[PDB]
Design a protein around this ligand. Sequence first.
Ligand SMILES: OC[C@H]1O[C@H](O[C@H]2[C@H](O)[C@@H](O)[C@@H](O)O[C@@H]2CO)[C@H](O)[C@@H](O)[C@@H]1O
Ligand SMILES: OC[C@H]1O[C@H](O[C@H]2[C@H](O)[C@@H](O)[C@@H](O)O[C@@H]2CO)[C@H](O)[C@@H](O)[C@@H]1O
Ligand SMILES: OC[C@H]1O[C@H](O[C@H]2[C@H](O)[C@@H](O)[C@@H](O)O[C@@H]2CO)[C@H](O)[C@@H](O)[C@@H]1O
Ligand SMILES: OC[C@H]1O[C@H](O)[C@H](O)[C@@H](O)[C@@H]1O
Ligand SMILES: OC[C@H]1O[C@H](O)[C@H](O)[C@@H](O)[C@@H]1O
Ligand SMILES: OC[C@H]1O[C@H](O)[C@H](O)[C@@H](O)[C@@H]1O
Ligand code: NA
Ligand code: NA
Lengths: 421, 421, 421
Amino acid sequence: TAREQRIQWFNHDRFGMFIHWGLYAIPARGEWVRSFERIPVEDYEKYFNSFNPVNYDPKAWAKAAKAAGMKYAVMTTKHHDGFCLFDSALTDYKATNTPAGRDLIREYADAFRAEGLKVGFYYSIIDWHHPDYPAYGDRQHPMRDNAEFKDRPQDFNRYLDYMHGQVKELLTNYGTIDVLWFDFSYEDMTGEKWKATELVKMIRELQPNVLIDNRLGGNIKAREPEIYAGDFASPEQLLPPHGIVNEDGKPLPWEACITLNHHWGYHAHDRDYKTPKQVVRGLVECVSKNGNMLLNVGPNAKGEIPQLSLDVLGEVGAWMRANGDSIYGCGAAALSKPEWGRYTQKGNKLYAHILDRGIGPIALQGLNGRVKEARLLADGAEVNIQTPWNAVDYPDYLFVNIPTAQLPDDFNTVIELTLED
Amino acid sequence: TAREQRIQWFNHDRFGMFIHWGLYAIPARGEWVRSFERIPVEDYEKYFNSFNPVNYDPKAWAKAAKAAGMKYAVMTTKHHDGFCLFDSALTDYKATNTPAGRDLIREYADAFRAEGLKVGFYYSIIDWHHPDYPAYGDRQHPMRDNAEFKDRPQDFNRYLDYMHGQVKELLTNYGTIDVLWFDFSYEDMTGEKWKATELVKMIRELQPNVLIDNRLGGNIKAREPEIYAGDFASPEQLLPPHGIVNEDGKPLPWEACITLNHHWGYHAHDRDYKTPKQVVRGLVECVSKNGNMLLNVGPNAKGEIPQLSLDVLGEVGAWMRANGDSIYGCGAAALSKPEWGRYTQKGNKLYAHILDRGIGPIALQGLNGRVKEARLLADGAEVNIQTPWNAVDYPDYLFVNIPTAQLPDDFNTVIELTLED
Amino acid sequence: TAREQRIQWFNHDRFGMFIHWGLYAIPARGEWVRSFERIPVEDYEKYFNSFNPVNYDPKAWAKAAKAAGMKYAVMTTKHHDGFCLFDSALTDYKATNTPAGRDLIREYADAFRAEGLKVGFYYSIIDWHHPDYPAYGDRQHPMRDNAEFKDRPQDFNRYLDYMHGQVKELLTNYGTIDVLWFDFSYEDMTGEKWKATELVKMIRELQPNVLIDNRLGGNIKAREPEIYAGDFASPEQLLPPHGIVNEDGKPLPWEACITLNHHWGYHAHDRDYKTPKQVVRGLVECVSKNGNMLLNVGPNAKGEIPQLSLDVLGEVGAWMRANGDSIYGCGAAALSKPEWGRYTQKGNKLYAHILDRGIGPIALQGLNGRVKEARLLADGAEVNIQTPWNAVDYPDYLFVNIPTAQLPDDFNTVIELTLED
Ligand SMILES: OC[C@H]1O[C@H](O[C@H]2[C@H](O)[C@@H](O)[C@@H](O)O[C@@H]2CO)[C@H](O)[C@@H](O)[C@@H]1O
Ligand SMILES: OC[C@H]1O[C@H](O[C@H]2[C@H](O)[C@@H](O)[C@@H](O)O[C@@H]2CO)[C@H](O)[C@@H](O)[C@@H]1O
Ligand SMILES: OC[C@H]1O[C@H](O[C@H]2[C@H](O)[C@@H](O)[C@@H](O)O[C@@H]2CO)[C@H](O)[C@@H](O)[C@@H]1O
Ligand SMILES: OC[C@H]1O[C@H](O)[C@H](O)[C@@H](O)[C@@H]1O
Ligand SMILES: OC[C@H]1O[C@H](O)[C@H](O)[C@@H](O)[C@@H]1O
Ligand SMILES: OC[C@H]1O[C@H](O)[C@H](O)[C@@H](O)[C@@H]1O
Ligand code: NA
Ligand code: NA
């Protein structure tokens, strides 16, 4: 019941902003740059010492997210590079010791909270800076192939204490936190290796309603999962072909995390953006399969969401002002996907998402005499659903009649169907 | 055997041009105008007297059609209004007696034959001009409610001699004809009322290989149908939700006849055209369901294919030049329609028609291990069909990786999959 | 004087087309694909077996080239992968044994020569197919790291027979060849390893006027260049900061070879194309430094120059139609590069290439009293070169006055200045 209760807002809200920001925004080629260029800590220091986000305005970020129709955010407090954007009492490697001279995470949390957005923190359990985190031979440590680190003396338990402490700070010093998005478990760096059981007990004594993703280890699909296996699953850079279900076939909460371009952190030459049309359609696809979408922005080193990112969000937002009822509080319908688009549903309201006008009337299989009313969501206008003369040979189908050659909305034209009961 | 042999070219070719043209291009408000405005013959004579197409160049027409990827054409030799565009020996109400002084059908037939298109003739079995065709009480004769025409002299046998005679002329005086498209039976005006059996015996005596539509009455869906039931079915202003089959579920040749705007004949104020994207996706749909598409143009009173119609056809043609292998000679795959578009197939070539890029790799159900090569049809380029890292939880899918945020072709990006065996 | 005489056409003509085509158009991610993916010959065979360009029309290629203002071409007869596009008697790995069954180089040579363009052949002295070319341990051979190839029996002399044979075929079987573009020498695979002296002596017995590039090894900048050092230098994917000179500071003939996108071979997802404006400016820059530009196209597997390449070439051509006098037969002026653009020169015609209108009148340092007439090259109109009232304090300058805020031509507005003798 507690599990079911704390996840309600999340399932209802459907659409979030991911935010990846850090020192990596200066090299501006990806958050993994220490790893793929094997950059030791001394060489990353020039980014630490020059990080000065003079145009950082998270109230403008939050207004952008809200206007986009997003209901929650998740921001990187510390990525794999170990740099804390928050004012930790446990390290010096944090934004308050850069020219930023401030807690960037407090500004984020206050701005998003004040717009009515739920406040999420991302926290990398990987740490390429902490000297006790394993390095020589690790799958992706920057110094994984540097023999100067082989058999260097380490106590992983100190890293864990550090990590457990930082999580405590995040859940004590920033008000109410709706999501903790850990990242990620791999090979033997999974489960109890993090003291995950203990981590999660501590978390639920501090903020019992917080939602955790499924990256600490374990198996969220098990009927009786471990305590750290997560409240929701997190497919990445794809939309599952089917909603994610557990081993009994029960729907699990899930959220697809998706980049706007191809990159999480700011990438100075990646302008290969998704269109607002694809963003809308992906959100609708996630909802149509009982899931959420977490759409990422990577702000530049000056602390700006890139203009192309904002242009996309503004148009998505225009669509959501008209069509949001078919997203918020909605889920999958018990019908196969139709030829012409997708369905989402909320009680006795079945939303037909017309992605492809086709030619002539639109055929909704299995719904003849199950629909009491049909209305265009965007304007509340009646849609004619009488079988036209040229379609009388197809009585298993309901027909929607659109008298224009093109749809009124090319992103997605939504028809609200009120089902008989 | 005879039935299968003669339809082969038609099933192969898939894509043709309907041409509605005649006196009704002057009132320019639809070919039913006499009917719906109850115009007597004397009032419509003004169109007969002023019909003089200054710019009728059926060689231009044929080049536009060929360029569009159309393989065949069907032109109106006489419509419901009874005006004949060919030089009939059986009436004076023909194009050679207008100021045009030409046999427009001869010109059409020659010009299209010259470009290598198959030549089809449409003949209205309804006639609102012939004195022996039923008028008073008719479902749609112009004079149906004019009681001054109740009890007018009538020998319907003379209309049948006229009709059977004109079809004999079309099939003797104009070389090899590939399609005869009759239109249409209604109420008691059906089947043997037309002497359909003697008509078709006459037709097959003269040109045994001609294809006939299914509007003479009859039931083409019957296990052994009437001899006049037709070679192909003719759904209209809709693309059937499923391919047309007979009672046993055997697939029938069929063809969807579709307007470019809302009108068959030229409508001077109808600029609500389908886009080239829509046309390409309509044809693909038809082929995916074992069917043809016959797309209409309605020339204006001067003999011109309207410029908006030529614009559409020009772009359709650019697509067909790159992608016609996925159309010509193809039909249905034995696979459900996939989420992202549609399949068409030819031997071991399965064509994936990507109509929505979605987000992430494109998931093809049931095809892992079943595909040997994948290539973009438009340029011959190799496509990567390796399961990406973020998709390993879905082993019953084949994944197509597209490295750009948008498809190369927004109409329809086609992927030629070479199947194993 | 042999050397000077045969290079004059090259220096005069300035602008050429590079064409990279072969089996690598299919995998469509660069001609180095065997090397960067360590592909063995057996897995590349799928491309040999499916190579059948449906739309290879080198007459169309040549018209495109001619209309761009290009005067010569150079085409890959055989790239690093060893596949020959010409009907060699010395190998079976050639285009007449693919489904194409064509000598692609013969058609190229005939098409270009008929349009009046000089005909160039590019030939890779590197060969990743020939069994005697060094593989294990080679800098870039596909099997360079494959243990199976270590210490297998090889005789490099057989590769030199093959290669010298193939060069003799190119120079005997295809008429007059104006350019031979060899590629490339590296580490120990340089100079007399190729038997380059014998190669060049043979070349010059067969076609004494052929121009050769500088990639067989040795030093074209030397005072005493080897016989195989070349007639022209070949900087790549940049425009050198100053014209190429030898050790005595004498100008050498040079050509910058430049891709239209980022790739030589066809790349199916690289649309990052240079604009016509950059193409013009780069040609101008090359000429302004006494060099040539060789601009590359990478045709697709069907043998089409990509649409986007053709768009750039046609807009370049339109500029060359008006302004080509400032390119052909032109070279460097003895002046520093001006603030507003660049100079080219031909006899007493000094062409000022206005790349940047600035604000107000344009200052040409050092030319006050040295210019008789000024004309706009495109329309032959006069240009006012009187010192304006607001510019009398600057008498070491000639001023060009443009009465409009913007230039007539944004690519480059060329003023022809006739010099006082
Ligand atoms: O092709 C000759 C002629 O055709 C049309 O002329 C019409 C005219 O507009 C009507 O008012 C009436 O007189 O019938 C004519 C046809 O005989 C075109 O309008 C005209 O441009 C053209 O010369
Ligand atoms: O199925 C193997 C087949 O591939 C090619 O056939 C093409 C044909 O060239 C096109 O005109 C169109 O019909 O699509 C076909 C399927 O790809 C080869 O040309 C042919 O040799 C081979 O049998
Ligand atoms: O020009 C002949 C033919 O070439 C291409 O056919 C390819 C086909 O796409 C591949 O799957 C494989 O079968 O090799 C064929 C060539 O041998 C074009 O795709 C096709 O349109 C064309 O007719
Ligand atoms: O979900 C996106 C996250 O996971 C990615 O796979 C990387 O670890 C990190 O760059 C990012 O924060
Ligand atoms: O196929 C379209 C045909 O049928 C239509 O229903 C009408 O009879 C006529 O306008 C047209 O020729
Ligand atoms: O000049 C360009 C040539 O050199 C390039 O560096 C590659 O070797 C080859 O793709 C090309 O033919
Ligand atoms: Na209207
Ligand atoms: Na790229």
